[PDB]
Design a binder for this molecule. Structure first.
Ligand SMILES: [Cl-]
Ligand SMILES: [Cl-]
Ligand SMILES: [Cl-]
Ligand SMILES: [Cl-]
Ligand SMILES: [Cl-]
Ligand SMILES: [Cl-]
Ligand SMILES: [Cl-]
Ligand SMILES: [Cl-]
Ligand SMILES: [Cl-]
Ligand SMILES: [Cl-]
Ligand SMILES: [Cl-]
Ligand SMILES: [Cl-]
Ligand code: NA
Ligand code: NA
Ligand code: NA
Ligand code: NA
Ligand code: NA
Ligand code: NA
Ligand code: NA
Ligand code: NA
Ligand code: NA
Ligand code: NA
Ligand code: NA
Ligand code: NA
Lengths: 16, 16, 16, 16, 16, 16, 16, 16, 16, 16, 16, 16, 16, 16, 16, 16, 16, 16, 16, 16, 16, 16, 16, 16
């Protein structure tokens, strides 16, 4: 999996 | 948001 | 039927 | 491995 | 127009 | 929502 | 079913 | 060969 | 006509 | 560079 | 023949 | 530039 | 892992 | 939207 | 090219 | 906008 | 205290 | 002075 | 609190 | 799990 | 060694 | 190559 | 010593 | 100036 930094506001690293 | 194609197996586009 | 790509977030093909 | 696109309903990618 | 993916089998892109 | 592929010309994805 | 991409030419998505 | 996506309607992948 | 995917950066479908 | 599929709505491949 | 998308990592189309 | 999908065998995207 | 579409030219999906 | 770190050289986080 | 942070375990930035 | 890193507990990025 | 970056998937800073 | 990470889209460090 | 990155030299993360 | 940054030499992220 | 991020205030990277 | 973080003003990553 | 982030492609920290 | 990450222990960002 990879870490992405996204927002939809909090910007969080998501483990995907 | 963006679409990522990842697996952890099913490979799915995730809306992130 | 037709395939639509939708999400509610995994994007999946739905057979309509 | 190979990716297949199959109805499981949702049509998704599957890693074989 | 929009492109639809439909089957009646072959799945065909349709110019609509 | 669903993604459609439509000519607006440029053919682009559209989120509905 | 699975979608296969085959030609016999046109390359056709097949609902299998 | 290359794959082209053309319509004359159905949009067909062509093995060229 | 055929669809080509080009950019000049958004990649768009162009109807040729 | 890479192609990303994002929206902010049109979903477009961006050459980045 | 059919096209399968496989990797051993670049994912390539293989003509089977 | 445009992306083409061509057999080089492996079928790959090529930037022209 | 995820698939990314990048070029450095061939554009290929990389399993990462 | 997401932040990507790319170069085409300066490496910058792009809001996409 | 872009830097991605992935694991398959060590998590490393990959130049892709 | 700017990104701040703040404890909300979880320390997260916040877009202002 | 120390900050650790953990996830259970958002990766957050945890104050320990 | 302090460094803030802002964008108006490249995210840059700004010396304040 | 928020983390600020400031210098007066060393650039120091400050717990504010 | 948590990410640690440790010299193994190369300093890399490690998932625990 | 590992790098830890701790405060006792300044948040300091520590070579451990 | 290596990444440096330098003020050019904007502080940006630079590939050397 | 100083840490530089370099690659020859994984980007690693190098202790110099 | 450039930011360097060095230790003599604490790892300190240095404004150079
Ligand atoms: Cl139909
Ligand atoms: Cl695999
Ligand atoms: Cl949505
Ligand atoms: Cl034609
Ligand atoms: Cl056949
Ligand atoms: Cl280009
Ligand atoms: Cl913004
Ligand atoms: Cl402490
Ligand atoms: Cl200050
Ligand atoms: Cl995990
Ligand atoms: Cl390089
Ligand atoms: Cl030193
Ligand atoms: Na059917
Ligand atoms: Na039909
Ligand atoms: Na056939
Ligand atoms: Na034709
Ligand atoms: Na037409
Ligand atoms: Na053939
Ligand atoms: Na504290
Ligand atoms: Na200064
Ligand atoms: Na200060
Ligand atoms: Na301490
Ligand atoms: Na040392
Ligand atoms: Na020093």
């Amino acid at each position: 999996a990879c870490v992405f930094f996204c927002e939809d506001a909090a910007i969080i690293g998501l483990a995907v």
